[PDB]
Amino acid sequence: VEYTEDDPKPQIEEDCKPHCVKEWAAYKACAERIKDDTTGQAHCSGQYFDFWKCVDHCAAPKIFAHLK
Amino acid sequence: NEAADGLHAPHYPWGHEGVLDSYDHAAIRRGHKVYQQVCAACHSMQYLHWRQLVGVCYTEEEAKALAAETEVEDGPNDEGEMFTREGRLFDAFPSPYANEQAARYANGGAYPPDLTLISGGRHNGPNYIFSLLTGYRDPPAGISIREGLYYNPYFPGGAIAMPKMLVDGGVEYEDGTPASASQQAKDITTFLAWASYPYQDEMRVMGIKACLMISILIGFAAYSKRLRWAPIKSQRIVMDVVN
Amino acid sequence: YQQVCAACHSMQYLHWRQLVGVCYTEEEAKALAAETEVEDGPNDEGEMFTRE
Amino acid sequence: VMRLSEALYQTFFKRSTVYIPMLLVGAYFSNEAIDYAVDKMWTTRNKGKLFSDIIAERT
Amino acid sequence: RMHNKIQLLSVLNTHLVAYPTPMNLNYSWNGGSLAGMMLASQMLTGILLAMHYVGHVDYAFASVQHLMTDVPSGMILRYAHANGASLFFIVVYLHVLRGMYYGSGAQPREIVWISGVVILLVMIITAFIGYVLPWGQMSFWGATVITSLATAIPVVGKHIMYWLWGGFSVDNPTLNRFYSFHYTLPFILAGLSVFHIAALHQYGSTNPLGVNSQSSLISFGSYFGAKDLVGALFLALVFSILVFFYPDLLGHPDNLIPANPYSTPQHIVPEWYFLWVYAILRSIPNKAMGVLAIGLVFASLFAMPFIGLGGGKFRIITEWLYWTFLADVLLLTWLGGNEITPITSFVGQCCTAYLFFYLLVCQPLVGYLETQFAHG
Amino acid sequence: RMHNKIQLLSVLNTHLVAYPTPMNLNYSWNGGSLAGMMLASQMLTGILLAMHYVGHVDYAFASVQHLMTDVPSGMILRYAHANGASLFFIVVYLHVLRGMYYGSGAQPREIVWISGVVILLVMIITAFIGYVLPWGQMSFWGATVITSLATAIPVVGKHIMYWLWGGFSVDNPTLNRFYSFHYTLPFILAGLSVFHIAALHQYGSTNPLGVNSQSSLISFGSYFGAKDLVGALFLALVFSILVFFYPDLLGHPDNLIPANPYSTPQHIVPEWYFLWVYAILRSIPNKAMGVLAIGLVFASLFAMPFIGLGGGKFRIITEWLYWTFLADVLLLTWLGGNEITPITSFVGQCCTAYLFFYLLVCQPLVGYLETQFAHG
Amino acid sequence: RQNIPLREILYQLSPYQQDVIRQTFTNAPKTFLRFFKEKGVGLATFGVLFFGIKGYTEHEMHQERLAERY
Amino acid sequence: TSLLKQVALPVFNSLATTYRSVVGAKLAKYGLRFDDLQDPLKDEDVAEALRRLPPDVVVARNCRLRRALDLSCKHEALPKDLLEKQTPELSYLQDVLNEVRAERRERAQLGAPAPYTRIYYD
Amino acid sequence: FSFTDATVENMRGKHDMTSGMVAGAVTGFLFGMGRPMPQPVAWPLAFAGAAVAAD
Amino acid sequence: PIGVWSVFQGYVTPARLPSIQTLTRVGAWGGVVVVGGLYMVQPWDWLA
Amino acid sequence: PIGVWSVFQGYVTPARLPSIQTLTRVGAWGGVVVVGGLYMVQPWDWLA
Amino acid sequence: QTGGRFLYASAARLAVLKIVMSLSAAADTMALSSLEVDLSGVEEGTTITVKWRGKPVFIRHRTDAEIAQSAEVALSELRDPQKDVDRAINPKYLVVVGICTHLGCVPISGAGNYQGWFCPCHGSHYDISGRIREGPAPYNLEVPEYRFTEGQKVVIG
Numbered sequence A: 001v002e003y004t005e006d007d008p009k010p011q012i013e014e015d016c017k018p019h020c021v022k023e024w025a026a027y028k029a030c031a032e033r034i035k036d037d038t039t040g041q042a043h044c045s046g047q048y049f050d051f052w053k054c055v056d057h058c059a060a061p062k063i064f065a066h067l068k
Numbered sequence B: 001n002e003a004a005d006g007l008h009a010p011h012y013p014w015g016h017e018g019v020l021d022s023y024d025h026a027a028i029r030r031g032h033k034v035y036q037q038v039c040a041a042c043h044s045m046q047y048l049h050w051r052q053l054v055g056v057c058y059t060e061e062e063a064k065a066l067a068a069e070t071e072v073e074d075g076p077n078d079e080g081e082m083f084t085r086e087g088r089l090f091d092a093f094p095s096p097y098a099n100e101q102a103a104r105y106a107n108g109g110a111y112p113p114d115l116t117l118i119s120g121g122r123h124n125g126p127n128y129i130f131s132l133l134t135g136y137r138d139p140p141a142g143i144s145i146r147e148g149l150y151y152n153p154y155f156p157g158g159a160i161a162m163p164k165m166l167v168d169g170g171v172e173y174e175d176g177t178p179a180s181a182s183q184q185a186k187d188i189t190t191f192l193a194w195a196s197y198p199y200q201d202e203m204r205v206m207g208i209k210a211c212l213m214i215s216i217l218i219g220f221a222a223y224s225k226r227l228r229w230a231p232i233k234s235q236r237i238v239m240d241v242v243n
Numbered sequence C: 001y002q003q004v005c006a007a008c009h010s011m012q013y014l015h016w017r018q019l020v021g022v023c024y025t026e027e028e029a030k031a032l033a034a035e036t037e038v039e040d041g042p043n044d045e046g047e048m049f050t051r052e
Numbered sequence D: 001v002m003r004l005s006e007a008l009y010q011t012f013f014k015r016s017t018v019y020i021p022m023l024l025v026g027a028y029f030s031n032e033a034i035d036y037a038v039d040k041m042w043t044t045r046n047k048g049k050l051f052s053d054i055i056a057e058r059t
Numbered sequence E, F: 001r002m003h004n005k006i007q008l009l010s011v012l013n014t015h016l017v018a019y020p021t022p023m024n025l026n027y028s029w030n031g032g033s034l035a036g037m038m039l040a041s042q043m044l045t046g047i048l049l050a051m052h053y054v055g056h057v058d059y060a061f062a063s064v065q066h067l068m069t070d071v072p073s074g075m076i077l078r079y080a081h082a083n084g085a086s087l088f089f090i091v092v093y094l095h096v097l098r099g100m101y102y103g104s105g106a107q108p109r110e111i112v113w114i115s116g117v118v119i120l121l122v123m124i125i126t127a128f129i130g131y132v133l134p135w136g137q138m139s140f141w142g143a144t145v146i147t148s149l150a151t152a153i154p155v156v157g158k159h160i161m162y163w164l165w166g167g168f169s170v171d172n173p174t175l176n177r178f179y180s181f182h183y184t185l186p187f188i189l190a191g192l193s194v195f196h197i198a199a200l201h202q203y204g205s206t207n208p209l210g211v212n213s214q215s216s217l218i219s220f221g222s223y224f225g226a227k228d229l230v231g232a233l234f235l236a237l238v239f240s241i242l243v244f245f246y247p248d249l250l251g252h253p254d255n256l257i258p259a260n261p262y263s264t265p266q267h268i269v270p271e272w273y274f275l276w277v278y279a280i281l282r283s284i285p286n287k288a289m290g291v292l293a294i295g296l297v298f299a300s301l302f303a304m305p306f307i308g309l310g311g312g313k314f315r316i317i318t319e320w321l322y323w324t325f326l327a328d329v330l331l332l333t334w335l336g337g338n339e340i341t342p343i344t345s346f347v348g349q350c351c352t353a354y355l356f357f358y359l360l361v362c363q364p365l366v367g368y369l370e371t372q373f374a375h376g
Numbered sequence G: 001r002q003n004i005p006l007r008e009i010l011y012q013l014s015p016y017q018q019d020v021i022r023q024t025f026t027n028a029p030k031t032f033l034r035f036f037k038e039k040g041v042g043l044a045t046f047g048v049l050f051f052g053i054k055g056y057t058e059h060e061m062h063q064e065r066l067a068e069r070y
Numbered sequence H: 001t002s003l004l005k006q007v008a009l010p011v012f013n014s015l016a017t018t019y020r021s022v023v024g025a026k027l028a029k030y031g032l033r034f035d036d037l038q039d040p041l042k043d044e045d046v047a048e049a050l051r052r053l054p055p056d057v058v059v060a061r062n063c064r065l066r067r068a069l070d071l072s073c074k075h076e077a078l079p080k081d082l083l084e085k086q087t088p089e090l091s092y093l094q095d096v097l098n099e100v101r102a103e104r105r106e107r108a109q110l111g112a113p114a115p116y117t118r119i120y121y122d
Numbered sequence I: 001f002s003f004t005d006a007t008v009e010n011m012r013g014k015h016d017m018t019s020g021m022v023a024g025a026v027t028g029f030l031f032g033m034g035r036p037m038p039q040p041v042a043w044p045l046a047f048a049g050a051a052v053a054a055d
Numbered sequence J, K: 001p002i003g004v005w006s007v008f009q010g011y012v013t014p015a016r017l018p019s020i021q022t023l024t025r026v027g028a029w030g031g032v033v034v035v036g037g038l039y040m041v042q043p044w045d046w047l048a
Numbered sequence L: 001q002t003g004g005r006f007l008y009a010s011a012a013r014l015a016v017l018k019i020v021m022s023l024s025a026a027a028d029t030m031a032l033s034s035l036e037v038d039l040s041g042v043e044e045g046t047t048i049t050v051k052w053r054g055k056p057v058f059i060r061h062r063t064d065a066e067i068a069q070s071a072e073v074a075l076s077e078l079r080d081p082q083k084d085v086d087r088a089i090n091p092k093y094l095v096v097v098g099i100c101t102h103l104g105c106v107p108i109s110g111a112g113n114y115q116g117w118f119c120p121c122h123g124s125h126y127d128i129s130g131r132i133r134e135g136p137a138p139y140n141l142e143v144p145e146y147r148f149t150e151g152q153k154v155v156i157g
């Protein structure tokens, strides 16, 4: 395969993002539900981790296919 | 807590993972060049010497020319003073700071750790290193980052003091390999994985020979065990007891 | 020793605390040691300094 | 059924002082064969990745 | 005849060559020879490593690294020592579980079981102080957490803690005295093993049938030397795999960071072979009660030859309860490696209670009922 | 009996309480128990010492100084461990001279004598490599002079020498391995001592009369416990005098200077108990011949039960010759601390020749003449 | 050495008059099945207890992590 | 209490018969009996009961133990014709052992010990 | 059968009938162990042929 | 067996148990251990 | 009285001494230790 | 014989006491048990770490809003009820021992849900005033003996 001077990883990560639409919906639901917070402790790190774990598991073997 | 644990890193298909597989020594050479130009401004690697790179990564003359471009403090002379000299093969890799306190002072209080054993010193070593280097993402909702800190979900706690350092084309490889950020990260991760386990290839060759020899010797010892026990396992006992 | 060969001879393995109750009291040894300068550090900037 | 030969028994097996040097030369050759097989398999599998492959490539 | 002329030939012949042994011993009776071989391996590789290790807080980690990279065969010796400790604990734990399954501590072999429990306690202390020697993060912080259990003793707790440390914290005198004690305790283990083996030779071994075996005895040297060689080669295979292919599999990555007394790790855990004791300690929310529970576990181990009834295959109720005990101790091993959590606290409490129930209630009472069932 | 039901109590009773001993043993039969007490004292003091000693160059001298001035009771421990080696060698030398006087190695006690000679060799090696550990001028230069004597074996010389040093000169690897070897060797000494005592118990001890004493034997544990305690109290008096009043009397002042590989002292002599071998070596003007003579002395010591005829009194010619042998050995001890001079070279050569003459000519031939005179 | 009263005839054959490992291939599946028949109940109750308690604990730990979310 | 045990005793008897059925099925393949499972080294009363026996009973017990140990070494069981003849519950020791234990219980109420000890070797 | 089949599928990184053949042979061997000896070959053949036909 | 088998076989009777005078004289060793520990540590203000 | 006492008494005759065949069979162990040392060290083609 | 045993017992006690005391703290270790901490180089809102007796001491310069926030916490929310004034002579300069009484772990400055010290061994949080709020720790953080001099120098130990 042809190796590119530009970074292929953001494009591959964007490609796997339709495969994890459910986790993205859960994260956006969390982000909407803590919008009116005032205590500064509400966060959505767990659903964010779920979404990025799904995307990472998709994109991991396709990232090293494009690298020497 | 999940946020204190941080995001786990996926399992990447490294070419040296199997017990039959060697290192990619071209990637070690390209990984050292990322170390010299990006890493070594703030990381020490104090247990490496230029002598250990010979036969793995460079020839003797290439490593000598690399070591001779460094300034090494030596002494004392006949007048009881400290001077500088050219580095040699027995010299260790230069440290960017004299001590931990100036390293903390140059980096907002955080000490950039030594990278000789950072691959074996982290859980899921190479995968965590690669995902940390290529993983400076946007923070999620409700997570704010103070000044001097940057978000990285692979770092435990999510707030690291190391900024984004790998950029496209920021290293000019001498074998024609195009240097994207991911290629640079993969090469430096390969070099660090070699640094934690420098004798992995020799250990695996010795392990293959040992496993073969012991597996043959198990059959030979089972043969000699069954030969000695044969007059007992086939003996005939006749008695008057019927019960 | 302090006025002749302190300028040219070393007394390592010897500390000011080993003179208290032998030839000086506590305050006399404190006042004697407070007249010397020793290298200490590094500080928060990573620099060596001198103290009493 | 299968049985060791008498003439081969009287030469290399009846005395321990003849058996032991034969044992040592057989041990030497067995180690050489195992070394050869392991090294050949390792070099064949990992061809193009070793340092010597890069050095011979640069000639 | 020639061994009748020298004492040392006679003792060796009697106890190694012509010693009668039950002919029906299976491969569960190989744990003792394997444990002795692993002790000899640990002593040899430790003596060889001591020629390059420096017991000072400024040079300990650096000398470990220098031994790893620069000393010829130093990596083999260091990995062999660190993984031979784990294989030593595997072989000894399987030996003890064999004795628990067959009830081998019963009369007339109470001395053998008691010297075994003494050996196991010395082994635990030896491994714990050996782990501090690399002076990594786990090496420092585990010694800090465990030696801080002495303050659970009232009045004189902190004084014993400071006496063991040599100061107000774990520092260089602790490392130096730990190095001396660690060099010393394996020789006490060798002496204890010689005494333990000579205690067993008074009456002999038990057999898998659980019956008297004096009618069917064969020589040890001709027959069980080869049978022990087979098991030694199976152990050497696992040893080779662990040394050469997966050397840090049974370790922790935090012990490759140098020790820092001003920043603790997020998950301080011991080696795997101390995890069941650690789970027993963590399950109870009281330090004195946890230390007492560990002491009561070892007291119940000492009191096994006098409260335990019930043995091998033909005593079937206790034979079935043995597997529940084994599942309980492996659940304790798994629970020690996990973080503190209400469900893990509850499950650890229940598992500790079941271990005490099996040791102190099942073994006397169910053993007595099955003796009354079989011979009443 | 209570000791008849536990096998540990039976062995202890048989070999320490009820063991039959001749009733006419004088105070020259207390050498062995004193030697065992000194071995135990050295082991205890050293294990305590190793908790404050660092076995590295540029830390060893400072760690010994920190031990001397900062560790509570550390000066007592160091001076006791230093002078205990001298007292250990005094006691073991008097023990060997007793055995030489009475012919104690003869049939059937040849194994006792041989195991004693092995113990003496291990004691010599242990004391030498322990003397290297403080890393002074005498330590470094004695280790240099002795280990660079393997260049007398042809061809395979400097290879063995450089493998011993771990380098090209005595340096940090030599000190680091000498620490491990010195820690380890006294446990071999203790095991060899146990074997040595067990070899004597097969036939029991000789008596000052030199006759069969089976008719007049008494219990060990009552009669020879207090008799050993008296001699132990005399030894404790001498030990306390040496530790507290003359702690550096038997040493060398040059060992209080830190080691310098580029500057050598004027006179390089070992400790006093090594001086007779040093005089034998230094008297002969050839290195290989000196090593051959040193080996021949110990070979003649091993061959003594098979060539030595003649015991204590009632064998009066060999009894008188013993005092010439004692004077010869003490003269060799005095000559080793002097400088090399033609008269001292001549006298040392004559003393070495007479030592070999007594060990190899007087003991068989004069003993045979005595047997032909007495019972011929 | 512990006299045992017994009446028997014992026969033994030379180890060089029989085979060594040839029957080991024939008896290997039968010995496998016999081993699992004899130790089936204990291994099963061990596996059931260990994996059931571990699975229940891991499930409730995951529920505990989910309960901390916002 | 009294008839408490009165009823609790048939349940004990049923459990004992089931236990003896299962164990005697296990024992019969080795040719053993329930009384062969008692070790003179493990119990001094069994050692006392065994020397109160006629010599042919002891010879038969030793023969059965030798056959079982040989079977255990060979990883075998008895053949079907021998296995159908096995009587695992034919007692030869229980009467003598019960008498020995009753004598020891009788001596203990008067402060006397048993007139024998454990088997001591060496 | 299922465990071994998916194991081979993951091991070979691709999908074909060979994984089913391995699963069938293993299943027949496990089923066929300890029986008279026209069987330990036939039963794996039957299971493997069934898997091949299923594919 | 000797520990709990002896209790279950009825071999542990009041006539076989040690006397109360024996238990008094054996249990007097507890004061010896206390005074030995006080002699070893000397942790007192008892001397006045 | 094992050693020089045996030869002084006349107990070491031409008989009771080892034969030539016995000494040759013992003397054949000289090659075994040489071959073992050469196997352990392996100085190949080191003979001058 | 009783006269002899009078000396035997004392000799044994003296020998055992000599052996036991050699593991106790050396003179240089005992000398390094007092340390002086400068407060002029500490700014408001930052935590300095000083090694006193080998131990991290979390001396932190506190602001007025931080002082009010630490004071506003009542005793009903504390496992060990104690006020901020009782644990600090100076509300601006809080001198506290950074070792948890649970097992001996060192929390981290500038972390936690209460903006104080987050001990990471067991997920136990501490407030800014060194009092226990969450975790398995029963006690509160230790406050060492200290006093203020005329040159902004604090003697600890």
Ligand code: HEC
Pocket: B038, B039, B041, B042, B043, B107, B110, B111, B112, B113, B115, B118, B129, B133, B155, B156, B159, B160, B161, B162, B163, B165, B166, B188
């Ligand atoms: C701007 C200076 C700087 C540069 C250049 C730099 N680092 Fe970092 N690095 C840091 C600091 C500061 C930390 C510690 C941050 C923290 O612990 O919060 C760190 C941490 C790390 C860690 C460990 C993270 C952890 O979880 O412990 C690794 C691995 C690492 N750096 C590798 C690299 C590599 C690879 C490069 C080159 C691409 C590099 N560093 C370049 C400053 C730097």
Ligand code: HEM
Pocket: E039, E042, E043, E044, E045, E046, E047, E049, E050, E053, E064, E078, E081, E082, E085, E088, E123, E126, E127, E128, E130, E131, E132, E133, E134, E182, E183, E186, E187, E189
């Ligand atoms: C005479 C015998 C022994 C000596 C001289 C010895 C010596 C040493 C030394 C010097 C070290 C530090 C070097 C290193 O960390 O790699 C060490 C480590 C260790 N030893 Fe030994 N040892 C001996 C026996 C034993 C025994 C019997 C055990 C039993 C379990 C044991 C367990 C350990 C452990 C667990 C470590 C830590 C290894 C690591 O994690 O790096 N040792 N030993």
Ligand code: HEM
Pocket: E028, E029, E030, E031, E032, E033, E035, E036, E039, E092, E095, E096, E099, E102, E104, E105, E109, E112, E113, E115, E116, E117, E119, E120, E193, E196, E197, E200, E204, E205, E206, E207
């Ligand atoms: C370094 C540790 C040990 C060594 C070298 C050792 C050695 C041996 C050996 C050689 C045997 C004889 C054969 C065998 O059963 O394997 C034996 C038997 C035995 N051991 Fe161990 N052992 C060790 C630890 C232990 C421990 C920790 C225990 C129990 C807590 C124990 C209890 C027993 C018992 C009860 C027997 C007799 C079992 C029987 O013969 O049926 N041993 N030991």
Ligand code: HEM
Pocket: F029, F030, F031, F032, F033, F035, F036, F039, F092, F095, F096, F099, F102, F104, F105, F109, F112, F113, F115, F116, F117, F119, F120, F193, F196, F197, F200, F204, F205, F206, F207
């Ligand atoms: C650490 C070193 C040694 C210890 C602990 C030791 C111990 C003993 C003891 C306890 C005895 C019995 C009591 C006595 O006669 O003194 C004895 C006797 C004896 N020892 Fe030593 N010994 C040591 C060194 C030696 C050496 C170096 C030799 C000879 C080269 C030797 C040769 C003998 C002989 C021949 C006897 C028998 C004396 C007789 O019964 O007449 N021993 N030894």
Ligand code: HEM
Pocket: F039, F042, F043, F044, F045, F046, F047, F049, F050, F053, F064, F078, F081, F082, F085, F088, F123, F126, F127, F130, F131, F132, F133, F134, F182, F183, F186, F187
């Ligand atoms: C387990 C037993 C022993 C241990 C751990 C031990 C330990 C040590 C240590 C750590 C040192 C260096 C510190 C110092 O020199 O003050 C030393 C020195 C020395 N050792 Fe020991 N030792 C043991 C037994 C022995 C024995 C049995 C002998 C004599 C036969 C001996 C003779 C010496 C000598 C002569 C020195 C030199 C002392 C000096 O001049 O300062 N040691 N030993």
